[PDB]
Amino acid sequence: CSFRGLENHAMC
Amino acid sequence: IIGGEFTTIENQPWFAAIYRRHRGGSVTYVCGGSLISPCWVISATHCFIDYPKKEDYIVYLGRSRLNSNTQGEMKFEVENLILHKDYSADTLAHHNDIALLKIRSKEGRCAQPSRTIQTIALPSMYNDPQFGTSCEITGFGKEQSTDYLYPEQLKMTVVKLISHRECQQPHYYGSEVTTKMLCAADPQWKTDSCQGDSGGPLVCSLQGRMTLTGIVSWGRGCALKDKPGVYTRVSHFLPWIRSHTKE
Numbered sequence: 001c002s003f004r005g006l007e008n009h010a011m012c
Numbered sequence: 013i014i015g016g017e018f019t020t021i022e023n024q025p026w027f028a029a030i031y032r033r034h035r036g037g038s039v040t041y042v043c044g045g046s047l048i049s050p051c052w053v054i055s056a057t058h059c060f061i062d063y064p065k066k067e068d069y070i071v072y073l074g075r076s077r078l079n080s081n082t083q084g085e086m087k088f089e090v091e092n093l094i095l096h097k098d099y100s101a102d103t104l105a106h107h108n109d110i111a112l113l114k115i116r117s118k119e120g121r122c123a124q125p126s127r128t129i130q131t132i133a134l135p136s137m138y139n140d141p142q143f144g145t146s147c148e149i150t151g152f153g154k155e156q157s158t159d160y161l162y163p164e165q166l167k168m169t170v171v172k173l174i175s176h177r178e179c180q181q182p183h184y185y186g187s188e189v190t191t192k193m194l195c196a197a198d199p200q201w202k203t204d205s206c207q208g209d210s211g212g213p214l215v216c217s218l219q220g221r222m223t224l225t226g227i228v229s230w231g232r233g234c235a236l237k238d239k240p241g242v243y244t245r246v247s248h249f250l251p252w253i254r255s256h257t258k259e
Contacts, residue, residue: 005106005230007210008042010062
């Protein structure tokens with residue numbers, strides 16, 4: 001969730 | 013952007029700043045994008061896949077600062093949010109990580125080119141710079157992996173393209189990287205894109221023209237040894253872009 005690829009993701 | 017330098021929108025006038033409005037009314041930054049025609053911004057599907065409703069988003073052009081207005085900026089609603097139907101997510105490594113936002117102001121207008129608002133050229137099909145070429149990346153993403161805040165001022169840096177041969181090595185990313193992706197990194201791993209840079213431009217000079225070679229997509233951490241940034245390879249998606257920009 002701190003990586004590029006997971007921006008604006010519900011699980012984060 | 014880890015390392016690199018502060019900049020303003022005049023140095024990347026196709027850069028689009030994409031925000032989401034919450035229940036609430038509170039607006040948060042989502043991702044970067046690139047203006048490829050007056051009415052079209054290109055970005056990454058992963059930025060939107062969990063909240064695919066067009067009405068949730070605000071796009072700015074001509075903006076140099078994250079949470080303050082830039083003189084001359086333009087604000088847009090998203091008339092259409094187009095995600096790639098073959099998008100797929102591993103635990104890291106997104107396939108077909110490419111999206112189109114059709115932009116329209118409250119007055120029903122698209123982007124008006126100015127000193128701070130310009131389009132970026134798409135590459136020719138299957139025409140990319142040779143590995144080792146220096147390219148630029150731009151965004152509002154974290155300056156350190158451990159940061160809580162995004163920088164208030166736009167940043168850019170330079171990274172070098174890495175061959176699929178080198179990136180597919182087990183001690184790099186192995187099978188996670190495909191020929192529809194481009195790896196890019198600093199030789200000392202000291203500068204990179206990071207969280208919040210997703211969707212933004214990887215720009216290379218190709219036959220003397222500034223070209224949207226890549227879209228920030230994914231990576232393990234930021235500015236880590238043997239862990240490059242991974243970018244959607246725009247030159248492998250021209251038919252998808254061509255068809256969907258007619259919508």
